């Protein structure tokens, strides 16, 4: 039927229904503007009174204006009619390519895979970067995270990843931009018309995009994640098909969250967000998952405001991966790129039993010395090298050089690095650091295993210094 | 020869020593007033907080 | 009698003012007071509805007449405002007549969607040696200036738009740049040198400063950006290049903090709003560059950031890097050893714009980057030792002075003379001498090869040789 | 679920070593039936490998005939992702040990007084085991993300908020739940309730308003720690910090 | 016209009023006490009631007691006769030497000089003292700083200053001690007169004296300073002078507003402050300038808390 | 009194921090709005008002004189915290003891570098 906003605040509107009242999670319809503003509700406060949170600008609406209820949650396109076409939060399409037409439609919101549903199934997957591999490697259907803080290449990496992984992969990909950069998006979108993941000509596409950025509403930022989820979602079930999910960046979801929790009235929570931090997210973060039916392998970018690693938010998060790759502007500031923190990344499949305690073996081994040379980075501080034991001298030197030899030039930062962009293969990487770490090389200069492919690259280098 | 390239030796190692002690200190000093306005205020705020809920 | 397009006030308090009437009233629409005091409704509540009071809330009096205007917030935008000083609602403080404004914008737009835009392709050029050469930027991008206070970081602003006259005074219309500055919570003393300064490089004439200084009302600040933001759009969207600088965003942040504490809204880190980071997310993203679709124009911004202790890891500062596409960073400690602009040029990035880059620049330029790398460490046998004097001595060429922007040729030139190593059995402290001798005589003589550097957007191999010739008897007439 | 702990009769001194089969536990911070021994640590530190690890060990004594040595295990799994619980199960049965062990699960999704209610709820079917005369080993994993849930609820039924934001009886809460484990006297059935709460820290932090609570709580703990891990002590415990407050009186006389 | 008292908690004070009711910002004056218990107008609350902060000690007031809007902000003398007096916040002499006789008040608040009134040059207020005015010159129409506590020359280096800057230029200077101790005040009284500046003789002094001792409750410390200036201000629009205005000290300033502002109880802002901090500070900073007619020119003591100048 | 009948009196406020914690408690139940270490906003006020009445009569009052000496408490030597910091303020010097003086030996444990007297010298004998 219809009703009347009462209240407006922000993206927080208040509607009253003198007959009916729209189930919490319905998406209702402002009637009076040239913009379709659909409204959702989120709570009743009685006295015939929902509340709702926009899904876009509110300036306009008044004390009056007409509300229809749609009788459902905000639904949206999904089908093989999606894939090339980028979607807003709400299904609308803004590809400026016509309409989507499709069969079936999607809610957003949706139950999660029961326990039964639940797959156990752990098979590595390569991404050709050496830190990543050798490790703390990803796992085909697995939840992978990427942490860091504002500028340590993220972003890079989740495209990087995007690269050597969704370029040459038989099965679809869904990319949600959730709170990022509008121009990150049109920068998306040529970049895979030209590889030609989108085609504009076909329905050959492998791709579908769903955006809703940094400039758009609390609400909208707030959703959006879902929107993306719900695609992937389908590809997954109705096709028990290989699916790619890439998000960037999941925490704009929770700030989102956190800007409306104010005027939904709760009271607040830890360093100010939302009471309904762990839930608000453990619901929507559990749909990304691979099932019996479906497989997906999800992809989620995760900033960490003020490189707070505590912070709620990514704090959180961590609970919900099965590999995480954690960034610090420490090490980047070194320009050891990818930032990758060695003794804070994880994966639950650093096991000899999956990876073969060769892998296992060389890994904590690296995170073994690694850890040493950190321990002795005090005393290093204040009276500096010489004061070293001479076996320390070296625990030194060889980290050092396993440091350096976990940088790799990645093939889009080709500009950055200006050097030519490597992807090095579980064998070499595994193999070039064992040796490392039997110090065959402990005849070469640092430099020389800073920024390279496998470790001949590396032996190779040292020889044009010298 | 050898103990006049030893004194000079670590006179210097130890004026370095000293400086880079110095260094850490005002960086330390550094984070020590960061935590100590954060303190400040987070307390502040859990106050306000459960005040305005009564 | 009237409660519908009307109201009077209840209460005016913590700066927000509860009004009863104005039923019609809008979200976001501009009311106005007895006082000729403007505002803002934001809150819509059944019995009462808050407004934002844009000036001193003391003129606020309980029970004063609250006319409606049925426009949403809104400033004047196009032509006319260039040359002109005007507070954050667009009225003109100058002094200088009034503003024939004839188009109007909401300071509240939404910014160009994923299509209606493509990748930073043309050059913004601060005619600062070490930012153009090293951190390009791009029209259309958003490049960060964050350092602590007195580093440098408001100079490079103006200097960016003293620059743009060689532009503007042009006869190509593809280069030419408009100029927006925003002075969010400065002392009003200091806008007004600016002002003046600009009007002695004649810059002023393509120049908007909007200000909403130290001793304006909160709101003032929290609109000016967004405001002035508008009337930059207005380039942008009709096929034009515009530059808006913000003065700082921290200081914007600020004021923000102020407005959502007062209005008892819940505090998180620092004691800001949760929503700090789309505060400044929105007013970011309305720049960017179109594709010739809507007129290939674009909005550049260079934001200012104002770090505490060169901490580059607050909220505030991660918040903005985390908008912009790359960051200019300044320390205070190379500020006070002389280097000045005092860049961290290893901290410094530009992302997007390094493709933006002019290629007669690039070919010297990639190569100082390079040389400049390898100082940076190597900070003894022939060749390290050697890397560090071409290291001290490339950095001393990248000193320049305040209010002298250089010609992009101009810079190649002088850069060329140090890349080339002619620079080197100099002692350092002699660098700066004769680099403004040497470009002064280039400038003088060789406008020829200026001109042709310029024009050939490169250095040609003719030029190059020419150009050795000059420099190494250049530095034979080199005494001391 | 809403039952009260035992009070002071119906108990006798912890005397019955509850095995874990880690040789570093097992020596140097001894866990014995109806003790609290909580395992706390920074997030990937091996934490669960310990109460996993210590179920998969009690084969041995179910698949056996002396009664008094047996062990029924529940686990609850507050706050994890079902991927987990399952894949958590899933190595339970493969070394066979899921038949012996109850796991109630209340997960990432599943309702905030569900998380709230669900270590109780996984506590009522241990003390059955222990109130007629049998052995119960339930461990609550974790006590952090349970907290963080009973927030939630306490928040958004407006009971002004403290430390953190949690609530004032967020003490009360792990107080109560972890006294119910006991070990009951003869005259009660000589049955048992030895209970593994699991906290998280973040950096390490123990002074953080939970993991200071839940310490001054159980009978002692296990530490974990990160830097030690990669180090090479795995499983990384740090001895010196790890204390058992029943000591020896629940070893054997060989250990 | 006439109010009344509604609620007194604290240094704040509710009064409602029938007819009229007094703008943000007036000058209400509690009748039937002994000594001037000035109210400033804080909010307006609704139903004819306005919300203050006291000027002076609250107690003794019953709800009903009759309150007269003055009809303006805190009013003040001003001019030459100010120089030499010790005037408290609201322009009360307190230095029992009668009587502030002048013509001219002025009110306390009030709004910085507008963009167009701005001068754009840049000179050096000249001192005369070699340190300074080589190495670190102040500006005429600038702020300084001035660091460091006792006995470093901080009282005779203002002396000099004060001396100086009349001597040779003719221009008068303006001390306000935003939260002075009442010792110390005492003291710098007869330091002023035995060196010079202050003449209880003759009319040569050279510098008006404004108090708002610790004692005093937030508002008044709050606002003393803004007295200072409005007595500064004097001289430099309506005689054209270049003025000194010393304040002593800048921190006691910032926290009367922190205390002020959270006895209206407005949630506090980072590690403390008001959130009304930087504006605060601004619209005092700000009057502070060169203006076509004139200039202040202004030494401000500062503490730093936790010597942390962050 | 006696400071006002040409009489010369000394008092000790031992503990002017724990006078502080029971104002702030009345405050809080009057539900008075909470600041720093949820003190109100008239702490500083409170101990300015009762400090700022010890003083040195003239002769034409009588000559007399109130002196205080207030005791603060500080946590973990912290004397930049609220109550600290306000007495510090509004005092004219520090006599500050340390703990590690106390068992070094210095008895009494006064720390001779921090502690100090803004009237000084003038306080003093001449021998002195
Ligand atoms: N390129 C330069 N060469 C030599 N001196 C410079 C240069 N740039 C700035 N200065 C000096 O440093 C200035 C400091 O202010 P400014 O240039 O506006 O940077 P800022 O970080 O914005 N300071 P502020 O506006 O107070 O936050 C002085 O007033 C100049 O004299
Ligand atoms: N993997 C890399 N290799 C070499 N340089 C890099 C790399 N990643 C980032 N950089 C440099 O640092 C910048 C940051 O890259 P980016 O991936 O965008 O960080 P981010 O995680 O996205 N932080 P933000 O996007 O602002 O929320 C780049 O634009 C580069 O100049
Ligand atoms: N004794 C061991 N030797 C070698 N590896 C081990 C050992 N114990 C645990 N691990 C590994 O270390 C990882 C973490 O173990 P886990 O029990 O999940 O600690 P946790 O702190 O509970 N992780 P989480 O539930 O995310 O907090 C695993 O994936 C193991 O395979
Ligand atoms: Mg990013
Ligand atoms: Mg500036
Ligand atoms: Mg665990």
């Avoid at chain 1, 109705?238 to 700030?255: A, H, M, Y």
């Avoid at chain 1, 501080?381 to 030039?409: C, N, W, Y």
């Avoid at chain 1, 039997?438 to 200069?445: I, M, N, S, T, V």
């Amino acid at each position: 039927t219809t009703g009347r906003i009462v209240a407006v605040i922000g993206a927080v509107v208040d509607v009253q229904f003198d007959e009916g009242l729209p189930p919490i999670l319905n998406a209702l319809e402002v009637q009076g503007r040239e913009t379709r503003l659909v409204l959702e509700v989120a709570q009743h406060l009685g006295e015939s009174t929902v509340r709702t949170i926009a899904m876009d600008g509110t300036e306009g609406l008044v004390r009056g204006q007409k509300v229809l209820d749609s009788g459902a949650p905000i639904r949206i396109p999904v089908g093989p009619e999606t894939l090339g076409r980028i979607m807003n939060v709400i299904g609308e399409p803004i590809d400026e390519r016509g309409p989507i037409k499709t069969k079936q439609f999607a809610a957003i919101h949706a139950e999660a895979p029961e326990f039964v549903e639940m797959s156990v199934e752990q098979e590595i997957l390569v991404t050709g970067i050496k830190v990543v591999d050798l490790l703390a490697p990803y796992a085909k259907g697995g939840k992978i995270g990427l942490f860091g803080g504002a500028g340590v290449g993220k972003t890079v990496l989740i495209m990087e990843l995007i690269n050597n992984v969704a370029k040459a992969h038989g099965g679809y990909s869904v990319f949600a931009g959730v709170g990022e950069r509008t121009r990150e998006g049109n920068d998306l979108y040529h970049e895979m018309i030209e590889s030609g993941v989108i085609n504009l000509k076909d329905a050959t596409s492998k791709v579908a995009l769903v955006y809703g950025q940094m400039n758009e509403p609390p609400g909208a930022r707030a959703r959006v994640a879902l929107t993306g989820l719900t695609v992937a979602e389908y590809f997954r079930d109705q096709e028990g098909q290989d699916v790619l999910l890439f998000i960037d960046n999941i925490f704009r979801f929770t700030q989102a969250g956190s800007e409306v929790s104010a005027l939904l009235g709760r009271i607040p929570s830890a360093v100010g967000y939302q009471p309904t931090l762990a839930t608000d997210m453990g619901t929507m973060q559990e749909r990304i998952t691979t099932t019996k039916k479906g497989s997906i392998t999800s992809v989620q970018a995760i900033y960490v405001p003020a490189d707070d690693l505590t912070d709620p938010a990514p704090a959180t998060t961590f609970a919900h991966l099965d590999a995480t790759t954690v960034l610090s502007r420490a090490i980047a500031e070194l320009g050891i790129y990818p930032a990758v923190d060695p003794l804070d990344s994880t994966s639950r499949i650093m096991d000899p039993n999956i990876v073969g305690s060769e892998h296992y073996d060389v890994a904590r081994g690296v995170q073994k010395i690694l850890q040493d040379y950190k321990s002795l980075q005090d005393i290093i501080a204040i009276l500096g090298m010489d004061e070293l034991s001479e076996e320390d001298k070296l625990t030194v030197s060889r980290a050092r050089k396993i440091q350096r030899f976990l940088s790799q030039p990645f093939q889009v930062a080709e500009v950055f690095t200006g050097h030519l962009g490597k992807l090095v293969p579980l064998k070499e990487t595994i193999k070039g650091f064992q040796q490392i770490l039997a110090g065959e090389y402990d005849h070469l200069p640092e430099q020389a295993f800073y920024m390279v492919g496998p470790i001949e690259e590396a032996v190779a280098k040292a020889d044009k210094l010298a | 020869e050898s103990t006049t390239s030893e004194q000079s030796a670590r006179m210097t190692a130890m004026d370095n020593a000293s400086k880079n002690a110095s260094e850490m200190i005002d960086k330390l000093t550094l984070t020590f007033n960061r935590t100590r306005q954060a303190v400040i205020t987070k307390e502040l705020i859990e106050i306000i907080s459960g005040a305005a809920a009564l | 009698v009237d409660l519908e397009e009307t109201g009077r006030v209840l209460s005016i308090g913590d700066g927000i003012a509860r009004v009863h009437g104005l039923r019609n009233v809008q979200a976001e629409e501009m009311v106005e007071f007895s006082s000729g005091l403007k505002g803002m409704s934001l809150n819509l509540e059944p019995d009462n509805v808050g407004v934002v009071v844009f000036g001193n809330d003391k003129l606020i009096k309980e029970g004063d007449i609250v006319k409606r205007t049925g426009a949403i917030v809104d400033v004047p935008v196009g032509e006319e405002l260039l040359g002109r000083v005007v507070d954050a609602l667009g009225n003109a403080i100058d002094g200088k007549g009034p503003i024939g404004s004839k188009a109007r914008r909401r300071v509240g737009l939404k910014a160009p969607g994923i299509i209606p835009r493509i990748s930073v392709r043309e050059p913004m050029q601060t005619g600062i040696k070490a930012v153009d050469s090293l951190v390009p930027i791009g029209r259309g991008q958003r490049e960060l200036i964050i350092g602590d206070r007195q580093t440098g970081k408001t100079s490079i602003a103006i200097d960016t738009i003293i620059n743009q006259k060689r532009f503007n005074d042009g006869t190509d219309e593809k280069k030419k740049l408009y100029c927006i500055y925003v002075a969010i919570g400065q002392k009003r003393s200091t806008v007004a040198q600016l002002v003046k300064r600009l009007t002695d490089a004649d810059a002023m004439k393509y120049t908007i400063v909007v200000s909403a200084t130290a001793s304006d009302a909160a709101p003032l600040q929290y609109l000016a950006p967004y405001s002035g933001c508008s009337m930059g759009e207005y380039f942008r969207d009709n096929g034009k290049h515009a530059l808006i600088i913000y003065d700082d965003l921290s200081k914007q942040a600020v004021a923000y903090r102020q407005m959502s504490l007062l209005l008892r809204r819940p505090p998180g880190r620092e004691a800001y709003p949760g929503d700090v980071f789309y505060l400044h997310s929105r007013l970011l993203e309305r720049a960017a560059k179109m594709n010739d679709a809507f007129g290939g124009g674009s909005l550049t911004a260079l934001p200012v950031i104002e770090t505490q202790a060169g901490d580059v890891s607050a909220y505030i500062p991660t918040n903005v890097i985390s908008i912009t596409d790359g960051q200019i960073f300044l320390e205070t400690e190379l500020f006070y050893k002389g280097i000045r602009p005092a860049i961290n040029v290893g901290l410094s990035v530009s992302r997007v714009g390094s493709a933006a880059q002019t290629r007669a620049m690039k070919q010297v330029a990639g190569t100082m980057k390079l040389e400049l790398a390898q100082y940076r460490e190597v900070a003894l046998d022939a060749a390290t030792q050697q890397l560090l004097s071409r290291g001290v001595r490339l950095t001393e060429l990248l000193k320049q002075g305040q209010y002298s922007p250089m010609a992009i040729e101009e810079q190649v030139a002088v850069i060329y003379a140090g890349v080339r190593g002619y620079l080197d059995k100099l002692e350092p402290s002699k660098i700066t001498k004769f680099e403004n001798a040497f470009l002064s005589h280039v400038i003088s003589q060789h406008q020829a090869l200026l001109g042709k550097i310029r024009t050939d957007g490169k250095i040609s191999e003719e030029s190059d040789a020419k150009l050795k010739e000059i420099v190494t008897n250049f530095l034979a007439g080199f005494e001391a």
